[PDB]
Design a protein around this ligand. Structure first.
Ligand SMILES: COc1cc(-c2cn(C)c(=O)c3cnccc23)c(OC)cc1CN(C)C
Length: 113
């Protein structure tokens, strides 16, 4: 494991704690959510992100944050605001962007000196 892989695994584990039922653990299928593929053209989930960390597919934290935001944006686009999925995606998005904020990353950058 590389220092980037270790850091991204840490960020991912903390995010996955917010989804205990595993709604974001694997890709959403049309069987589980009718007409999902008709609406969502760029699917994303924690499991896909996990495989990208393991395969060393993330060159930056920015790229990781973009996949995370995409996963939350998809759930907020497909599901209506009064749903469990939309509410959880908005909660997860807020938790991820405070944890991986520019301030938290600048403090990390400074500690790498
Ligand atoms: C009802 O349980 C599930 C829900 C979803 C689910 C997720 N998201 C993100 C959605 O937007 C969504 C929207 N509509 C319907 C369902 C979902 C799921 O997708 C991987 C898997 C399960 C199966 N479960 C045993 C883990």
């Amino acid at each position: 494991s590389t220092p980037i892989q270790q850091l991204l695994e840490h960020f991912l584990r903390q995010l996955q704690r917010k989804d205990p039922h595993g709604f974001f653990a694997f890709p959403v299928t049309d069987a589980i959510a009718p007409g999902y593929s008709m609406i969502i053209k760029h699917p994303m989930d924690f499991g896909t992100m996990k495989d990208k960390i393991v395969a060393n597919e993330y060159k930056s934290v920015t790229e990781f944050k973009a996949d995370f935001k995409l996963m939350c944006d998809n759930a907020m686009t497909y599901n209506r605001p009064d749903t469990v999925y939309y509410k959880l995606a908005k909660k997860i998005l807020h938790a991820g962007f405070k944890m991986m904020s520019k301030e938290r990353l600048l403090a990390l950058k400074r500690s790498m000196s």
